[PDB]
Scaffold this active site. Structure first.
Site, PDB file in Angstrom:
ATOM      1  N   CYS C 152       0.788  -1.243   0.000  1.00 21.04           N
ATOM      2  CA  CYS C 152       0.000   0.000   0.000  1.00 21.04           C
ATOM      3  C   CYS C 152       0.805   1.270   0.000  1.00 21.04           C
ATOM      4  CB  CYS C 152      -0.888   0.294   1.187  1.00 21.04           C
ATOM      5  SG  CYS C 152      -1.086  -1.014   2.387  1.00 21.04           S
ATOM      6  N   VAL C 156      -0.183   4.173  -2.657  1.00 21.37           N
ATOM      7  CA  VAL C 156      -0.730   5.454  -2.257  1.00 21.37           C
ATOM      8  C   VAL C 156       0.167   6.587  -2.752  1.00 21.37           C
ATOM      9  CG1 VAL C 156      -1.321   6.865  -0.198  1.00 21.37           C
ATOM     10  CG2 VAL C 156      -1.905   4.439  -0.295  1.00 21.37           C
TER      11      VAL C 156
END
Ligand code: CFM
Ligand code: CFM
Ligand SMILES: [Ca+2]
Ligand SMILES: [Ca+2]
Lengths: 467, 522, 522, 468
Positions: C152, C156
């Protein structure tokens, strides 16, 4: 279709030699037939021996007694916990039905005789299982052939220890089937157990005392019978063999009526208790609503109006319950054809229950039954339906092949044959580890079971989508 | 009563109140049952060390035997041959029992006949039963072979099988060279394993004895494998698999894996696969013969060494790591075939499984029973896993066997608390698991009654059963598994470790009591 | 205290009185614990229909999920390729977790690296981590391939994987045609199965996209098999076995069965087996491609149909009788190879097992969860056995999947009481097994906590777990088994019937209470 | 041999690129080393993240609180019930340690922010688990990167519901290892929990109040410590994190002494409770007889003579018991060489217990420890023994290959590697599902576990008899 059936019998029988052909022709009929003699050698008879008839069905179920399979290790092993004759007890302490007590004959016992070994075995039984209320000694083949006198041992030891020791000469060579073993077992109870309380007048009887004679409580079968008879006001003093104690057997001369379920295995002692004690006896059938109802009415008719009233109240209570069973399952089983093959009562008795689910029994037959069983069968079966006495493996396979039934109901030595042929199968001996099948609660399980097997998804997948 | 949408079978129907009161009335009115407090007293006495002493003084009474009789074995031996009818000369009740016994274990058809000797035969011999019996059998069931054994009735009255078979050929009841091997299998000598041996030795003599001068040892370049009394489909299949992996020519003599597992496809197959008569006739030409279960194949060993002149290797049952290695290495040097990378890898994966699981297996105490070779291979493999085989029972074991197993126990630190018991039975073992409580038992279905007896004393005293053996009647399809080879060792390792972890989860499944050890990862 | 000959681990040591009193003193003196009577009250409320209604109103809180995140899948995909390092661009904590998670399931080494992106990378990109990361990895662990996915953190902040890999080749950190396929695998889109799909599609594009004009469909005469997220060694092995039995040329694309089961022989093997780069380059030449688990291989289907121009068969997961048949028949007509007698027999043995066991299986109620294809194949096979799949949970299922399973439930009388739940989790399922109690649950190890919750209400309410799925952490070596094919159906049938019979023995093991139904034969 | 070791380090390091070689040389020493920075990319570090340090070790074990892994589904799954931090409770009703509460981020939450979803999640937690005594919200990577303010949500919701909601910004990208997450977790307890009862004077203290700080009760470890301290007369008010309640944490400012087991994870808050409340603190070691004895004596020396008497009585009681353990197992383990690799305390602490069984620890090293841990290690380890900070997969494999130890004690990502090499292995994190290893009757368990694995039959069996 009577000529198709007539022609079928003839065709199957051509694979035989001559004296087999002649003898088996006598044992295959379209609904007279001859029954209960010998099996023909090398033809894969489904029948057992006289030992199975005695230890396996009459004696073995007697709960608080120790039954000794006197002989080699085989018989006791194969029959250890094979039949589901249910009981309440603490096995190994006060109850012993599922244990295997054996004298385990070695060559020294064959050569010298097994009576000194039996005498010491009885003492060992007494020091290790103190709470047994009696001992039977079930003879396997060798015992009679080597000339042992287990009666001497039973009397001297029985006197010495003030314990009932029943000698049963039920050697597997004796007789032609399990049938003689039943007879030998009934006479063994007559001579060594039943008469014990003839002097004793201290049992407080009532006008409603009865005994279930010949219900071996397969899967709880007798418990489902007893509840109904006792709700109807009657008192069940005894249950013969299934969950039975020795004191119930000893108390059976005190009842007002003997209720014979299994005629082939218990008619002998029922006739004797009517001779010696005057106790009337009757046949009944607790397979399916129709039959349990006519039976409850007929048993009640032997007593007064308060038992006939209680009878009609009992019928009324269970009527919503069995009507839901037929409402659920009879749509699912209507017009399905059943072929049967069991031993000496069930070939005739379960027909009623199948008909209450709209099923037609197109063929039935007995392993070890006599002609008085086949006179009872005639009336229950329809026209041109197939009858077969002591059917050979070959014959049963060939009849099914042709007649093409929707359900086969037979034993364990037949089960996996027909399932491989795509025919649905239900064991009508062990109930396929289900049951009870007696009474009203038993009808719900019976009906659930014929349905689960006849309409199972698996039967539509016997053939590969490519062949 | 009954609710039609939720129908109750025997359990739990007789737990309903009207049934529970009815049974209470039966007991109280007519059973003259012993006081419950007395039943408890006697139960607690059956668990003691004092009772156990009285239990091992038994000389005449056998209770809950862990063996069967000779002809059972002879039937399983016979089913292993191509289009062969097992036939047991004597009483018919026997054959109904041997068929049922095997039907319930394999959940399959077990075909076998009797010649239905009655009382008449007792006084005048079963000679006509042999004559008619073989004729009817040949014609009704169409077998290429009929293998005859005997029940006690026929043994006690001394029917000469040999003469009876020769007179039925002479009188024309069966063709003169229709194969009818025989064996006298008396129920009162030995056990079911003895009957397998006797039957095999009889079939080997029938195809061999009178034709040896033609045979050269090693000419077909194959090795014969005699399986013994074997009731796992995976053991026949794994021996074959490994031998084929090695590219070793073999001949499995008595192979029932096809008949005991035919497909449900719309037809019944009475016969399927099996060892051909041609493999039995050509068997003296093998380089050698390996006996997979040698402690119940002694008669066979003497015939293959004495008549076929084979030098039978001193090999234990190929169970566990060391004995499967020893097996493959003997096969490697008799055939001259190297052990392939696939079996070297499978051995390594088994050792990997052993290293992954040893923390749960170590120090685990077992009571176990069974046939002689199965028991010593299970004892060896348990010692290899770092487990203690505390109670070793083999009812049909002999003195020499006991000495061979005490010798393998002596060589391990895990066999220091172990004792081998021959001639003793499951009521004897019921006491040893009370007075010297193990963690589990490895045995057949008759062991379920020992487990409920130990739970009756209490949960702390319960000894769980792990079903490995014969007969397994209360579980489905475990006859398909494997106990031999590396495959077999992997299956037993996985059953032993997971039975242990199951029982740990069971003991720690109690909320705020014992669940602090109800670990996700073990 | 401690007795040195009988040492106690946590269980049962903290059950000793001095420990039990000590913990009682801790609770009472310092925990300010809720009254036990209140804990019971709230527990009984958690079992109600009222609680269940409030439990399914959850919009923000997920409790006890039955799914993992995308990069987990990408690692398992990657391990299936020859001498390939899975590499997950981003945070290192992730890689420690994916390695541990798989280590505990397979009980094996799971090799995978991270390029250890810290806070500095968050503000300035992880570009230098890709450059150094791939260089160090290539040299330290010597892989023929490195398959990059993301955590992640990297998603992101939008690190372009493609650019980062091209710049590390340009600057000379890794050789210009050293294989570095990539996939953006965001933990917040989908689940672990989505990450397997994305990874495979990325590796397929890397060996194929820029070389299609050379390829002819059907020229190598093989069929490609894409397995999906698969955590049973027996499923890879059985697909291969059956295809080889048929004599069908195949190419299993992503095959981790060797790395996930190396032998313990004195050496560690970081890499073992796997799909070669040559099989991936030549894969467009296959007659077709079969997707074994199609509901989590949608991106892959679009690439094999769109770029390779294969006509991917509409085949369900080969689980159960009907879908294994349908699989073999599609393979038969694509390859033109007939189904051999061996597989026709194995089908028949499975149907034989079904007929032997149906009385115990019929009407049996199950709650079950897992990945989409595993769940629908288990639902199909339960309907074939005559069982009722009452609670079907698939946290990572989608709406179309739910409609495909409600459709297969609708076609059976055994799916009338069944409901399919997508997006729901194991705390949701904890309520469904209380308010509409099934007989058993088929699921992973996280289901053990549902079983102890149902036992806390009482024995009558206990719903036993049957461990089939991922992850299985509390039992040893069940990762070796099989759920696909006829083999797989035989293993599940034997587990389902025997769990049932075990529970019946457990319920009838009470002396003179319930043991009247403690049958030897079942 | 100090030059064999010196030469070993150098050889292993040649397979690297240049900046890896230079950095790893600094992190490998013969007993002087640098510690706690970054891991080198692509080198298969055994280290976890700051989230593991907070949720996995400090917060997660707090029993009557619900811990929310705020982010995607991964972290909460992989860490669900992975560490055996034992507790007494009714899980899902009043206790919650082994459950996974997560906000399960989808793309809409990444794009819009997860604070409204967190607010509703807190309400849902309150309607479904009424008996929780507090809530933590453990941030996973995305939370800090997308700019969420979980502190706002915690204060507004915490006030609204009159419940303690602790925001923990322990995002896995933060820091270099699990270490920073421990620090972040200690400061999270300081700011939102520990000071709650500074006003409250109603706790009836005694001269013997103490708290176990940094025992996470792995396999019951803390319970085996606590029993000994309380038999010695002391009262254990708190147990930090392992089987700990929020009210014990809140009560820890009332004790007379803080007993630090794990220095690396709890030194931070111990220093703070001595600044703000004056509570002295000390390091102790309950691994093996020798160390449990010197620890029991040193803790007792901080009090009066009645605690020193009870100390000597406690030592006397357990002396037959541990002497039987060494009598049984020390003959079986004497002279065996152990190589270790854990995280931030155990590499140093278990050495005593191995030496009590006559074992030599020939190599040890930490994943995430600082230099003050390596100054403590120096004294415990012998001459020319190998030290390694944040060892790479390659390095640990290569050191074992050469050194050839009799036992390796490391984590789960190492276990199956060395078992395949024929080296016996014991997990020194999860204790290989065994334990307790603390105190006297955890020494019994420790000792039989090293024996069962080191002298196990399987080890003699790794080579096929036809390969020889
Ligand atoms: S085969 Fe009954 S005369 Fe006897 S065991 Fe079955 S059809 Fe018997 S009804 Fe009975 S409980 Fe029987 S089912 Fe007469 S007792 S020798 Mo095999
Ligand atoms: S690796 Fe302890 S500083 Fe921390 S989980 Fe293990 S050597 Fe941790 S002692 Fe502890 S209970 Fe630990 S064993 Fe400090 S708590 S981040 Mo992995
Ligand atoms: Ca079958
Ligand atoms: Ca492994």
């Amino acid at each position: 279709s009577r000529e198709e059936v007539e022609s079928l019998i003839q065709e199957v029988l051509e694979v035989y030699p001559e004296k087999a052909r002649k003898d088996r022709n006598k044992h295959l009929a379209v609904n007279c037939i001859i029954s209960n003699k010998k099996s023909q050698p090398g033809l894969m008879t489904i029948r057992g021996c006289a030992y199975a008839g005695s230890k396996g069905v009459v004696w073995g179920p007697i709960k608080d007694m120790i039954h000794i399979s006197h002989g080699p290790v085989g018989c006791g092993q194969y029959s250890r916990a094979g039949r589901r004759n249910y009981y309440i007890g603490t096995t190994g302490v006060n109850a012993f039905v599922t244990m295997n007590f054996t004298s385990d004959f070695q060559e020294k016992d064959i050569v010298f005789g097994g009576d000194k070994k039996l005498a010491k075995l009885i003492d060992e039984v007494e020091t290790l299982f103190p709470l047994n209320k009696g001992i039977s000694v079930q003879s396997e083949c060798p015992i009679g052939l080597i000339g042992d006198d287990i009666e001497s041992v039973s009397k001297v030891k029985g006197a010495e220890l003030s314990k009932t020791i029943v000698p049963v000469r039920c050697e597997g060579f004796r007789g032609v089937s399990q049938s003689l073993g039943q007879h030998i077992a009934n006479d063994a109870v007559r001579d060594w157990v039943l008469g014990k309380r003839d002097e004793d007048t201290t049992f407080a009887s009532t006008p409603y005392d009865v005994a279930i004679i010949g219900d071996y409580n397969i899967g709880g079968d007798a418990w489902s019978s007893r509840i109904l008879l006792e709700e109807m006001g009657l008192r069940c003093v005894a249950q013969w063999s299934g969950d039975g104690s020795i004191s119930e057997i000893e108390l059976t001369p005190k009842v007002k009526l003997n209720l014979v379920h299994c005629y082939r295995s218990m008619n002998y002692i029922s006739r004797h208790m009517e001779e010696k004690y005057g106790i009337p006896w009757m046949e009944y059938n607790f397979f399916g609503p129709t039959k349990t109802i006519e039976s409850l009415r007929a048993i009640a008719a032997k007593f007064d109006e308060s038992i006939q009233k209680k009878c009609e109240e009992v019928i009324a209570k269970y009527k919503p319950e069995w009507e839901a069973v037929v409402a659920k399952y009879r749509p699912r089983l209507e017009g399905k054809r059943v072929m049967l093959y069991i031993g000496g009562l069930r070939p005739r008795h379960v027909i009623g229950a199948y008909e209450d689910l709209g099923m037609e029994v197109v063929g039935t037959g007995y392993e070890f039954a006599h002609n008085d069983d086949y006179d009872r069968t005639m009336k229950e079966m329809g026209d041109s339906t197939l009858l077969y006495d002591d059917v050979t493996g070959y014959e049963f396979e060939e009849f099914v092949k042709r007649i093409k039934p929707d359900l086969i109901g037979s034993g364990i030595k037949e089960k996996f044959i027909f399932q491989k042929m795509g025919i649905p199968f239900r064991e009508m001996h062990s109930w396929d580890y289900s049951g009870p099948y007696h009474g009203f609660d038993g009808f719900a399980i019976f009906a659930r079971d014929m349905d689960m097997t006849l309409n199972n998804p698996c039967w539509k997948k016997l053939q590969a989508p490519w062949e | 009563s009954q609710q039609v949408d939720k129908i109750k079978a025997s359990y739990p129907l007789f737990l309903d109140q009207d049934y529970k009161d009815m049974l209470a009335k039966k007991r109280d009115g007519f059973e003259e049952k012993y006081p419950q407090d007395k039943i408890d007293e006697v139960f607690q006495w059956t668990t003691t060390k004092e009772y156990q002493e009285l239990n091992f003084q038994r000389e005449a009474l056998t209770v809950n035997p862990a063996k069967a009789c000779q002809p059972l074995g002879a039937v399983l031996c016979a089913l292993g041959f191509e289009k062969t009818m097992p036939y047991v000369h004597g009483s018919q009740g026997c054959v109904a029992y041997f068929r049922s016994y095997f039907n319930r274990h394999f959940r399959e058809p077990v075909s076998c006949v009797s010649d239905s000797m009655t009382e008449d035969a007792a006084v005048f011999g079963g000679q006509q039963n042999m004559k008619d019996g073989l004729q009817n059998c040949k014609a009704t069931y169409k077998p290429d072979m009929i293998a005859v054994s005997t029940t006690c009735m026929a043994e006690v009255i001394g029917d000469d099988l040999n003469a009876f078979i020769n007179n039925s050929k002479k009188e024309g009841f069966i063709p003169d060279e229709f194969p009818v091997p025989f064996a006298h299998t008396p129920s009162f000598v030995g056990s079911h394993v003895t009957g397998w041996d006797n039957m095999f030795e009889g079939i080997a003599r029938y195809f061999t004895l009178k034709s040896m001068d033609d045979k050269v040892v090693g000419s077909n370049k194959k090795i014969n494998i005699v399986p013994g009394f074997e009731t796992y489909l995976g053991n026949f299949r794994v021996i074959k698999r490994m031998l084929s992996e090695m590219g070793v020519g073999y001949s499995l003599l008595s192979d029932p894996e096809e008949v005991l597992d035919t497909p449900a496809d719309g037809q019944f197959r009475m016969y399927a696969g099996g060892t051909t008569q041609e493999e039995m006739k050509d068997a003296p030409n093998a380089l050698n013969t390996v006996l997979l279960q040698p402690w119940h194949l002694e008669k066979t060993k003497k015939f293959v060494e004495g008549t076929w002149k084979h030098e039978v290797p001193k090999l234990n049952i190929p169970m566990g790591l060391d004995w499967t290695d020893e097996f493959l290495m003997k096969v490697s040097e008799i055939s001259g075939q190297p052990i392939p990378a696939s079996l070297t890898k499978e051995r390594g994966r088994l050792v990997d499984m052993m290293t992954d699981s040893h923390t749960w297996l170590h120090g685990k105490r077992f009571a176990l029973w069974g046939d002689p070779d199965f028991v010593m291979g299970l004892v060896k493999f348990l010692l290899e896993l770092g487990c203690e085989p505390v109670h070793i029972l083999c009812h049909n074991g002999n003195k020499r066997w006991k000495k061979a197993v005490d010798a393998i126990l002596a060589a391990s630190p895990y066999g220091k608390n172990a004792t081998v018991y021959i001639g003793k039975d499951l009521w004897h073992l019921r006491s040893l698991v009370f007075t010297d409580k193990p963690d589990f038992m490895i045995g057949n279905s008759y062991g379920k009654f020992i487990q409920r007896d130990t739970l009756h004393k209490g949960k702390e005293f319960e000894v769980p059963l792990i079903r490995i053996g014969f007969p397994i009647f209360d579980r489905h399809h475990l006859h398909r598994s494997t106990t031999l080879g590396y495959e077999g060792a992997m299956q037993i390792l996985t059953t032993l470790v997971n039975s242990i972890l199951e029982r740990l989860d069971e003991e720690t499944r109690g909320m705020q009591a014992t669940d602090y050890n109800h670990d996700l990862v073990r």
